[PDB]
Design a protein around this motif. Structure first.
Motif, PDB file in Angstrom:
ATOM      1  N   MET A  56      21.237  78.292  64.190  1.00 42.65           N
ATOM      2  CA  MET A  56      20.847  77.899  62.851  1.00 42.65           C
ATOM      3  C   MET A  56      21.818  76.801  62.457  1.00 42.65           C
ATOM      4  O   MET A  56      23.035  76.996  62.510  1.00 42.65           O
ATOM      5  CB  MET A  56      20.909  79.069  61.846  1.00 42.65           C
ATOM      6  CG  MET A  56      20.615  78.645  60.418  1.00 42.65           C
ATOM      7  SD  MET A  56      20.311  80.025  59.298  1.00 42.65           S
ATOM      8  CE  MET A  56      18.491  80.136  59.424  1.00 42.65           C
ATOM      9  N   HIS A  57      21.292  75.655  62.070  1.00 37.78           N
ATOM     10  CA  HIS A  57      22.107  74.527  61.692  1.00 37.78           C
ATOM     11  C   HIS A  57      22.807  74.764  60.332  1.00 37.78           C
ATOM     12  O   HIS A  57      22.193  75.304  59.409  1.00 37.78           O
ATOM     13  CB  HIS A  57      21.249  73.246  61.694  1.00 37.78           C
ATOM     14  CG  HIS A  57      22.030  72.030  61.310  1.00 37.78           C
ATOM     15  ND1 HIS A  57      23.113  71.604  62.061  1.00 37.78           N
ATOM     16  CD2 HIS A  57      21.886  71.210  60.247  1.00 37.78           C
ATOM     17  CE1 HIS A  57      23.570  70.523  61.453  1.00 37.78           C
ATOM     18  NE2 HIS A  57      22.877  70.254  60.349  1.00 37.78           N
ATOM     19  N   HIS A  58      24.099  74.391  60.227  1.00 38.17           N
ATOM     20  CA  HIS A  58      24.844  74.555  58.979  1.00 38.17           C
ATOM     21  C   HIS A  58      25.433  73.208  58.499  1.00 38.17           C
ATOM     22  O   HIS A  58      25.316  72.884  57.311  1.00 38.17           O
ATOM     23  CB  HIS A  58      25.995  75.585  59.133  1.00 38.17           C
ATOM     24  CG  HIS A  58      25.580  77.024  59.035  1.00 38.17           C
ATOM     25  ND1 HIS A  58      24.706  77.596  59.950  1.00 38.17           N
ATOM     26  CD2 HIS A  58      25.966  77.970  58.150  1.00 38.17           C
ATOM     27  CE1 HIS A  58      24.572  78.857  59.573  1.00 38.17           C
ATOM     28  NE2 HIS A  58      25.317  79.127  58.492  1.00 38.17           N
ATOM     29  N   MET A  59      26.085  72.436  59.403  1.00 37.24           N
ATOM     30  CA  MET A  59      26.767  71.214  58.970  1.00 37.24           C
ATOM     31  C   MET A  59      26.906  70.111  60.024  1.00 37.24           C
ATOM     32  O   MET A  59      26.704  70.352  61.210  1.00 37.24           O
ATOM     33  CB  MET A  59      28.180  71.612  58.488  1.00 37.24           C
ATOM     34  CG  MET A  59      29.013  72.192  59.586  1.00 37.24           C
ATOM     35  SD  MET A  59      30.565  72.915  59.042  1.00 37.24           S
ATOM     36  CE  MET A  59      31.530  72.622  60.455  1.00 37.24           C
ATOM     37  N   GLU A  60      27.334  68.913  59.585  1.00 34.40           N
ATOM     38  CA  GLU A  60      27.609  67.788  60.474  1.00 34.40           C
ATOM     39  C   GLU A  60      29.088  67.473  60.415  1.00 34.40           C
ATOM     40  O   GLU A  60      29.624  67.338  59.324  1.00 34.40           O
ATOM     41  CB  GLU A  60      26.819  66.544  60.050  1.00 34.40           C
ATOM     42  CG  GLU A  60      27.087  65.331  60.927  1.00 34.40           C
ATOM     43  CD  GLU A  60      26.204  64.144  60.603  1.00 34.40           C
ATOM     44  OE1 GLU A  60      25.019  64.173  61.002  1.00 34.40           O
ATOM     45  OE2 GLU A  60      26.684  63.196  59.935  1.00 34.40           O
ATOM     46  N   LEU A  61      29.738  67.321  61.569  1.00 32.63           N
ATOM     47  CA  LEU A  61      31.157  66.981  61.678  1.00 32.63           C
ATOM     48  C   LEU A  61      31.396  65.461  61.514  1.00 32.63           C
ATOM     49  O   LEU A  61      30.451  64.681  61.672  1.00 32.63           O
ATOM     50  CB  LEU A  61      31.689  67.510  63.024  1.00 32.63           C
ATOM     51  CG  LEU A  61      31.626  69.037  63.149  1.00 32.63           C
ATOM     52  CD1 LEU A  61      31.947  69.494  64.554  1.00 32.63           C
ATOM     53  CD2 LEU A  61      32.559  69.694  62.158  1.00 32.63           C
ATOM     54  N   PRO A  62      32.632  65.006  61.191  1.00 36.59           N
ATOM     55  CA  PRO A  62      32.848  63.569  60.976  1.00 36.59           C
ATOM     56  C   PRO A  62      32.420  62.639  62.107  1.00 36.59           C
ATOM     57  O   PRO A  62      32.090  61.493  61.815  1.00 36.59           O
ATOM     58  CB  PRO A  62      34.354  63.471  60.703  1.00 36.59           C
ATOM     59  CG  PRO A  62      34.708  64.804  60.116  1.00 36.59           C
ATOM     60  CD  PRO A  62      33.863  65.772  60.908  1.00 36.59           C
ATOM     61  N   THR A  63      32.399  63.098  63.368  1.00 41.55           N
ATOM     62  CA  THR A  63      31.958  62.232  64.467  1.00 41.55           C
ATOM     63  C   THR A  63      30.428  62.122  64.609  1.00 41.55           C
ATOM     64  O   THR A  63      29.953  61.516  65.573  1.00 41.55           O
ATOM     65  CB  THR A  63      32.570  62.676  65.793  1.00 41.55           C
ATOM     66  OG1 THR A  63      32.325  64.079  65.974  1.00 41.55           O
ATOM     67  CG2 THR A  63      34.060  62.361  65.872  1.00 41.55           C
ATOM     68  N   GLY A  64      29.672  62.724  63.694  1.00 44.68           N
ATOM     69  CA  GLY A  64      28.216  62.675  63.765  1.00 44.68           C
ATOM     70  C   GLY A  64      27.587  63.828  64.517  1.00 44.68           C
ATOM     71  O   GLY A  64      26.359  63.934  64.545  1.00 44.68           O
ATOM     72  N   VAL A  65      28.392  64.697  65.166  1.00 44.87           N
ATOM     73  CA  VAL A  65      27.842  65.875  65.881  1.00 44.87           C
ATOM     74  C   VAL A  65      27.628  67.062  64.924  1.00 44.87           C
ATOM     75  O   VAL A  65      28.040  66.991  63.772  1.00 44.87           O
ATOM     76  CB  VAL A  65      28.650  66.262  67.128  1.00 44.87           C
ATOM     77  CG1 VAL A  65      28.712  65.094  68.110  1.00 44.87           C
ATOM     78  CG2 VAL A  65      30.039  66.771  66.737  1.00 44.87           C
TER      79      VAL A  65
END
Ligand SMILES: Cn1nccc1C(=O)N1Cc2ccc(Cl)cc2[C@H](C(=O)Nc2cncc3ccccc23)C1
Ligand SMILES: Cn1nccc1C(=O)N1Cc2ccc(Cl)cc2[C@H](C(=O)Nc2cncc3ccccc23)C1
Ligand SMILES: [Cl-]
Lengths: 302, 299
Positions: free
Chosen positions: B156-165
């Motif tokens: 289940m998707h929650h967030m995006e990290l600073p590198t775009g992943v």
């Protein structure tokens, strides 16, 4: 952020896949309302494929010769007609899962989703493009005939391709849903080959604009080019000629990024000359051509 | 012939996607039987027990197509919010909640406003992130595999990290990786290549007539792992070797024989050549994905 080769959700198409059997041949059919569409070569008995006379083979068939299976239910065929290279089997039950749909014929460079099926059962979904040489670089095994290509526009499914055959180089040929082949191919196992393929230039430019939108600018340069000089260079790398229509189509992406189409063409010219020098663009070491300008806008913005 | 990055047919999952709204936040939910699962950050350092205790059932607006579902209860399990609804989903497939290991692949049905917009295939990286394609509104989008007629929900998707992943949890709310569901300084660790998957992809290239990279050489597993360590490749275990057995038997190329090809590819590169239309060594196809795509398994 991120950029993936994305296919459309296949659910509306899965509810239309059926298995069609005529004698010893089994392939897939597309059941929409009370008609099942499938390749007409389902009536061929292999030693027919060299020079089949489909009208002569079809006249010798009755409705009960075609066995249609939707899940664990056998549909009853009440009529049959041929339209170009597609066989249309009239059935006694309309498909309750029939989505809102259209039959659309696409041009080379256009992309679509493929729901690969075997025995009327969907096994996978992938994204691909109609190559300039009218073939598709698909993933198909024997029994995949009748698998379909589509796009989804809001809630409407646009059927654009039906799989018919594999050429000797491992590439695939098929028809639109009206039975007209894409390319100079025929449903005969005669000696035929895909023409020399070329790169879809407008799609590579769209993918370069998507890379800029995602923060990558290393490949840009201070140069511009005339459209003619770009085509003179690109043709030497087996790239499709870029037309004024392609330039117009790239206008929205040019306005969003602030990079004129002919400036991005100069960057592409330089990439063809230098290669990538150990660098990647959107996680790729090759120039990607299976994303249209429309796909880029849809995925990078919505 | 042909080799594509292929996702599972998304139909069984599409029938479960709903839109969940709490205040000004809108994300996606997964409606299975009479429960809707969604990221607990829809109610947003946050004390989630304190934020949730202040909510009532009617604060959560759940929309399945053009129908509003009524919430009759709510509870939290780790980083997932479970909203009890009055109506059981009639389109609920046979399913399981499964936690996957890095290197394992899955299909992602990317959704916005409870509406599925795309399906793609991806792998759980060794650093526990996924290289997905998500925008604002994608939260609650799910990753899955299909086994016969059973859907195995794994992400289940929650967030995006600073590198775009991307970062997310299993369906029981446990994050993959050292991530937390809040706005703070966090980053993906140094990633590595999934070796067993690259070998599987080299076997798929052989099956499709691409043999230029093959050589007469073999290697010990120990000598190969020293090369893998030098090129930021994950260590190859005896289990990986065993798992590659069927592909080794089909092509006639021993796993350590294919490891010697990979060793030469790592020290010398591709030299202008491609493998399955790629100038990079692909690692997002498991040995099972290769067997499934080169056999035609259906769902
Ligand atoms: C491939 N081939 N080269 C020479 C003879 C054949 C051959 O197996 N067929 C001959 C043939 C000729 C014309 C038409 Cl319209 C269809 C077909 C059929 C076909 O092409 N089927 C397939 C369709 N899609 C992917 C396939 C992959 C692997 C096997 C078969 C596939 C059968
Ligand atoms: C990315 N970011 N950097 C600073 C602040 C944010 C930020 O937009 N979010 C903060 C945040 C913090 C904790 C958790 Cl669990 C979720 C989130 C949200 C998130 O990450 N959502 C997204 C998920 N996937 C792709 C997204 C793309 C574009 C926007 C948002 C996306 C919102
Ligand atoms: Cl078109």
């Amino acid at each position: 952020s991120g950029f993936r080769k994305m296919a459309f959700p296949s659910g509306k198409v899965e509810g239309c896949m059926v298995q069609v059997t005529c004698g010893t041949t089994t392939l897939n059919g597309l059941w929409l309302d009370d008609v099942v569409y499938c390749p007409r070569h389902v009536i061929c008995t292999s030693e027919d494929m060299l020079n089949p006379n489909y009208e002569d083979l079809l006249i010798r068939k009755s409705n009960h010769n075609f066995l249609v299976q939707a899940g664990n239910v056998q549909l009853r065929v009440i009529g049959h007609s041929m339209q170009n290279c597609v066989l249309k089997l009239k059935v006694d039950t309309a498909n309750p899962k029939t989505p809102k749909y259209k039959f659309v014929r696409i041009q080379p460079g256009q992309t679509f989703s493929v729901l690969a099926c075997y025995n009327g059962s969907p096994s996978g979904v992938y994204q691909c493009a109609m190559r300039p040489n009218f073939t598709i670089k698909g993933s198909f095994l024997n029994g995949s005939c009748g698998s379909v290509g589509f796009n989804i526009d809001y809630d409407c499914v646009s059927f654009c391709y039906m799989h018919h055959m594999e050429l000797p180089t491992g590439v695939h040929a098929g028809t639109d849903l009206e039975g007209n082949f894409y390319g100079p191919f025929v449903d005969r196992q005669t000696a035929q080959a895909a023409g020399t393929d070329t790169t879809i230039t407008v799609n590579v430019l769209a993918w370069l604009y998507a890379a800029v939108i995602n923060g990558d600018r290393w490949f840009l340069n201070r140069f511009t080019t005339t459209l003619n000089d770009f085509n003179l260079v690109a043709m030497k790398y087996n790239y499709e000629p870029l037309t004024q229509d392609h330039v117009d189509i790239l206008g929205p992406l040019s306005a969003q990024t602030g990079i004129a189409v002919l400036d991005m063409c100069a960057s592409l010219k330089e990439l063809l000359q230098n290669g990538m020098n150990g660098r990647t663009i959107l996680g790729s070491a090759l120039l990607e051509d299976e994303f249209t300008p429309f796909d880029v806008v849809r995925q990078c913005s919505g």
